[PDB]
Subunit: 116 residues, 4 copies
């Protein structure tokens, strides 16, 4: 469906497995409303967060719990989390893949936006 | 200078100049209280945000207005901003350089943490 | 199969399509021998470069023609190409995904190495 | 200083120190002729590789020995090295900073190209 997140580990060269993340939508009143959540699979992917009709226009935030991921590996990393904040579907529906690449003191994030 | 931010532009191969950003400290009630801000210099750098005495342990957020930067260049961006959230000084004062590399649909951020 | 390359465009937020690349293997005599080549698909992927039995231990180089990609979009980029040089299969066979993320003056590259 | 290389370590959040690298210029017969080398300082920087007069147009390669760096830290790396291949000075002399960010299974490289 319309929103997928793929998370890689740049130290081990592997998908980043069991990484928790929470998705929020900015409300009319400017607050962050809980939208969805899940944890990455063995392939570092999280699918099924939302549907085409629920995923309307708006500003979305994906908060990826990268600190817990590193802590479980014994590492105290720099970032509390990796955030990804973006306007979605403002020219009509699109399908978003959020790619995140994680190191203890660095994190990249990239979007692949395609038309269904 | 305990906190410095350096921003580069991966499309133009240059420092990212006049990029605004705000720094926040997480309050006891878990809200973000803004306490410093600035814009990058002609070398893409922002210095002088805080002092050693002020920069106590806590959770800090740097919100970099990448969307305005790309809009000023006439380039469509993906992100609303780039946010850098970290716990500072957890075993003593350190000097933090946040290095941010910007593309319209991608950014990376790195910390260089010294003495 | 054992070697896949996925190339993304960080300016347009899209797969980088029709990107040419050449794979070389370092020979016993230290020269770079042509190993395989291909161009990325509409999904920014190149598959079928090699087989499990051909892809023996050795030092491999993937030379991705990123300059031509940017030039065809009107852009004069920094890099002549993005190279990816690595020892493969030295603890037994593995499956390698090379992920490359391209901007006119920057390029990241990451490997996902998994056991079949 | 027409060419500077700055290398950071994404695992330790620090400059990458004592990283060796070699610089080559592509010859007329398409072989690479080595002409400069050095290792990064305690701030992860390598200066003084060439001079304005020597650094003429051509295709240059910087080969960064990331594998030795990771081996010295006891960390398994993926890449044999990180190579930065570019045409220099194509419309006049510029000042190039190559910024490299290193992880064991990933690296990124960026050019900051000025006047
Ligand atoms: C977008 C994407 C999807 C994907 O699906 C799974 C697979 O093909 O195995 C597999 C890969 C490797 C990518 C590309 C990707 C995925 C994550 C990632 O961090 C990066 C860096 C360039 C930031 C690239
Ligand atoms: C190129 C550079 C120059 C620099 O001078 C600032 C100082 O004097 O501390 C300080 C730093 C940290 C960098 C490195 C840098 C600066 C920004 C940046 O986005 C990147 C990414 C490639 C990771 C690296």
């Amino acid at each position: 469906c319309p929103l997928m997140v793929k998370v890689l580990d740049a130290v081990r060269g592997s998908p980043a497995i069991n990484v928790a993340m929470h998705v929020f939508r900015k409300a009319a009143d400017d607050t962050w409303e809980p939208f969805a959540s899940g944890k990455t699979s063995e392939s570092g992917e999280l699918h099924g967060l939302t549907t085409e009709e629920e995923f309307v226009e708006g500003i979305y935030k994906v908060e990826i719990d990268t600190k817990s991921y590193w802590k479980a590996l014994g590492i105290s990393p720099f970032h509390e989390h990796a955030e990804v904040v973006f306007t979605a579907n403002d020219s009509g529906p699109r399908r978003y893949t959020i790619a995140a690449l994680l190191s203890p003191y660095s994190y990249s994030t990239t979007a692949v936006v395609t038309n269904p």
